[PDB]
Structure formats: structure tokens, C-alpha cells
Amino acid sequence: QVSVQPNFQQDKFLGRWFSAGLASNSSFLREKKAALSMAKSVVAPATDGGLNLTSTFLRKNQCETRTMLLQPAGSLGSYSYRSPHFGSTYSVSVVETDYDQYALLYSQGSKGPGEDFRMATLYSRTQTPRAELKEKFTAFCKAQGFTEDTIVFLPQTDKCMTE
């Protein structure tokens, strides 16, 4: 069902990415769509062969950090995320990437209260992705059945982007 980047090279997907686009079926996210902001995500190899994703972003008047272990899930580019707080499991796939400019990610709830969740994410190596890259994201979101009102390009913040 979910496309995973052919011949995915985990060693080339590491380092700093910015979340520049988001689309989801979460009513909660839809309702604060306007208040959502760009996050800075750092990808590093995890001790289990998968990836650690550490994201920092501005919410209210403070920088928040979140860490996510992406465990290998059967093929390179396909991962599983298990929420420590809600026991929910999600499939996370790197659908398409050129490693030095952009990545398209797709996440799907599998088990638990988050089971019906689905989300597409645009990762960019810079805070200002070219229009063509934003086209690839819009096109992916539409094809996957996300509607125009749930697709957002996350505006940059002047905070929580450092180190």
C-alpha cells in the first residue's frame, strides 16, 4: 500500500531537517492549523539499527523538544513508532527523498487509540524549499486523499531553530 523510497540509504538521511509541510486527518491539528509552525528535526542512527528523531519547535513562549524512536519495520525506509504515553503504534515510511533537498514522509496509525491517524510530512534541508519541492508535497497529499483544507505549509519561526 505505502510506497517506500527505492534503495533507501539510511546513512544519507541523517542530520538536520526542517518540517516545512504537514497534512493530516486529525481534527485537533485542523483546528490549530494556523498556529502550527516549522519544527527542526535532527536524525541520528539509533542503537537498534533504526533512527532517532529529535524535534524542536516553538509553542506558546517556549521551545519544546520531542524524541521519537523509529524502529526498523521490515524494509529500509519503513519504520515503526510506538508512543510511550498512549501505547499507540504507527507505521512511518520515507516515501521519497533526494537526501540533500527534501523528503516526503507518510505516517499511519496501526494499533491503539491512534489507529485511524494518518499524516503526510514534507521535510526540507533548508527553511525555504523551492516551489517545485512544495509541488511534490501538494501532489502527494492530494493523491493520498488529504483535502486542501488539511494541507499546510508550516511557516518558519525565528526561535527554537538553533544548535
From Swiss-Prot:
Disulfide bonds join C63-C160. Changing M38A: Reduces enzyme activity almost ten-fold. SUPFAM superfamilies: Lipocalins. Abundant in the brain and CNS, where it is expressed in tissues of the blood-brain barrier and secreted into the cerebro-spinal fluid. Abundantly expressed in the heart. In the male reproductive system, it is expressed in the testis, epididymis and prostate, and is secreted into the seminal fluid. Expressed in the eye and secreted into the aqueous humor. Lower levels detected in various tissue fluids such as serum, normal urine, ascitic fluid and tear fluid. Also found in a number of other organs including ovary, fimbriae of the fallopian tubes, kidney, leukocytes. It holds the Pfam family Lipocalin. The keyword Transmembrane does not apply. The active site is at A39. Keywords: Cytoplasm, Disulfide bond, Endoplasmic reticulum, Fatty acid biosynthesis, Fatty acid metabolism, Glycoprotein, Golgi apparatus, Isomerase, Lipid biosynthesis, Lipid metabolism, Mast cell degranulation, Membrane, Nucleus, Prostaglandin biosynthesis, Prostaglandin metabolism, Secreted, Signal, Transport. It comes from the Eukaryota. One of its GO terms (molecular function) is retinoid binding. N- and O-glycosylated. Both N-glycosylation recognition sites are almost quantitatively occupied by N-glycans of the biantennary complex type, with a considerable proportion of structures bearing a bisecting GlcNAc. N-glycan at Asn-52: dHex1Hex5HexNAc4. Agalacto structure as well as sialylated and nonsialylated oligosaccharides bearing alpha2-3- and/or alpha2-6-linked NeuNAc are present. It catalyses: prostaglandin H2 = prostaglandin D2. One of its GO terms (biological process) is mast cell degranulation. It is an enzyme of class 5 (isomerase). GO terms for cellular component: endoplasmic reticulum membrane; extracellular exosome; extracellular region; extracellular space; Golgi apparatus; nuclear membrane; perinuclear region of cytoplasm; rough endoplasmic reticulum. It is found in: Rough endoplasmic reticulum; Nucleus membrane; Golgi apparatus; Cytoplasm, Perinuclear region. Induction: By IL1B/interleukin-1 beta and thyroid hormone. Probably induced by dexamethasone, dihydrotestosterone (DHT), progesterone, retinoic acid and retinal. Repressed by the Notch-Hes signaling pathway. Glycans are attached at S3, N25, N52. It has been proposed that the urinary and serum levels may provide a sensitive indicator of renal damage in diabetes mellitus and hypertension. Elevated levels in the coronary circulation may also be associated with angina. Changes in charge and molecular weight microheterogeneity, due to modification of the N-linked oligosaccharides, may be associated with neurodegenerative disease and multiple sclerosis. Detected in meningioma but not in other brain tumors and may be considered a specific cell marker for meningioma. Expression levels in amniotic fluid are altered in abnormal pregnancies. Forms a beta-barrel structure that accommodates hydrophobic ligands in its interior. Monomer. Belongs to the calycin superfamily. Lipocalin family. This is Prostaglandin-H2 D-isomerase.
